[PDB]
């Protein structure tokens, strides 16, 4: 965990800004764009590599450092802590290969869920696609909670991380016996009708994605793949989902269906398928920005001054002298 909270923020955000333009970031750029402390940043990077925060990269000529997955996770968690959202960690690990579930607790002690997108060419594309997936998933959760669907309340997001409302329960697959199958089944077709009314069709609406909150409430998650009803294949996905729910109910709980909704109703709800006149203070600020720009250029071109080549040349000269 974190102990010192002074300059890992600035160095790691400098690494993040380095990753946005190119693969492997030299230390000169980090020292130029993180200018609060100078000289001691080498030992800061030496302290970061003892964890899995950053990683060195020196193959034949390129010499730099890159951000790892755990460093990005701690960066998002630090940004959440700056928002006063996470204080302690609950270790109920939902270990998935597409997402990691970590319980969090705020200063008030109220527990929330934390979704960390792990997607699995090097890992910069993995982190960027994780960021895009987290952004679109947060947008989808916001839309579904605005449309009053039975989903948790979204709380916050930071660049891959989603702090999300916590509801305890088990998925519908590993609940062997249900006392009232008919009521929750009718509610399931009610939710299917609601989703189809909202200009949306799931495509892979599975029972494993349905979490039984105390076997009384339905919790629904995992919408990166959410598609439109304007597609000609939309009703085929809708009928596939309906038949999947039907065969699951006549196959697992031994309960036979009574209502058979086959309605395509688009779009009677919201179309979510798209979803000295200048004062001297300004003069001072502009001149300060200019002089910081020239001194940042100077710091860049001074920090950009390969000792491995000089060491190899010295070794070659010494070997030529001692061998001839």
């Amino acid at each position: 965990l974190r102990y010192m909270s002074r300059d890992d923020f600035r160095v790691l955000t400098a690494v993040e800004m380095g990753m946005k333009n190119h693969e492997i970031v030299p230390g000169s750029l980090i020292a130029s764009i993180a200018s609060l402390k100078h000289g001691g940043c080498n030992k800061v990077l030496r302290e970061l590599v003892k964890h899995k925060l950053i990683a060195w990269e020196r193959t034949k000529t390129v010499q730099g450092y890159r951000l790892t997955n755990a460093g990005y996770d701690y960066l998002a968690l630090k940004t959440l802590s700056s928002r006063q959202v996470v204080e302690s960690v609950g270790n109920q690990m939902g270990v998935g290969k597409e997402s990691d579930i970590y319980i969090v607790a705020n200063e008030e002690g109220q527990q929330f869920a934390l979704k960390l997108h792990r997607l699995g060419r090097h890992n910069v594309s993995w982190l960027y696609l994780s960021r895009l997936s987290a952004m679109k998933e947060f947008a989808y959760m916001k839309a579904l909670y605005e449309r009053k669907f039975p989903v948790p309340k979204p709380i916050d997001y930071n660049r891959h991380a989603v702090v999300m409302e916590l509801i305890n329960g088990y998925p519908l697959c590993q609940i062997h016996h249900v006392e009232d199958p008919a009521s929750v089944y009718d509610e399931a077709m009610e939710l299917i009708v609601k989703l189809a009314n909202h200009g949306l069709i799931h495509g892979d609406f599975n029972e494993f994605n349905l979490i039984l909150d105390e076997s009384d409430h339905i919790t629904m998650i995992d919408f990166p793949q959410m598609v439109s009803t304007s597609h000609p294949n939309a009703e085929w996905y809708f009928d596939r989902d309906v038949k999947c729910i039907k065969d699951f109910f006549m196959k697992r709980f031994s309960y036979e269906s009574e209502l058979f909704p086959t309605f395509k109703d688009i779009r009677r709800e919201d179309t979510l398928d798209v979803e000295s006149t200048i004062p001297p203070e300004l003069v001072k600020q502009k001149v300060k920005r200019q002089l910081t720009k020239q001194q940042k250029s100077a710091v860049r071109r001074r920090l950009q001054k390969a000792n491995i080549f000089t060491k190899q040349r010295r070794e070659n000269m010494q070997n030529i002298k001692s061998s001839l």
């Binding site: 000295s276 006149t277 200048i278 001297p280 003069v283 001149v287 002089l291």
Partner: protein
């Protein structure tokens, strides 16, 4: 005439005042940059160190 001429001379007077304002802004920026460069040089010479 006496309307187009008035409009043209109003635009000319507006431009003249605008150029005077721009010249004042340029001289103010030059003076402030000069005194800030003097302050940066004084920082370079003294009040820079540890003890």
């Amino acid at each position: 005439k006496e309307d187009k001429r008035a409009r043209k001379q109003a635009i000319k007077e507006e431009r003249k005042e605008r150029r005077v304002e721009k010249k004042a802004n340029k001289l103010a920026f030059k003076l402030e940059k000069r005194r800030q460069e003097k302050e940066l040089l004084n920082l370079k010479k003294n009040v820079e160190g540890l003890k």
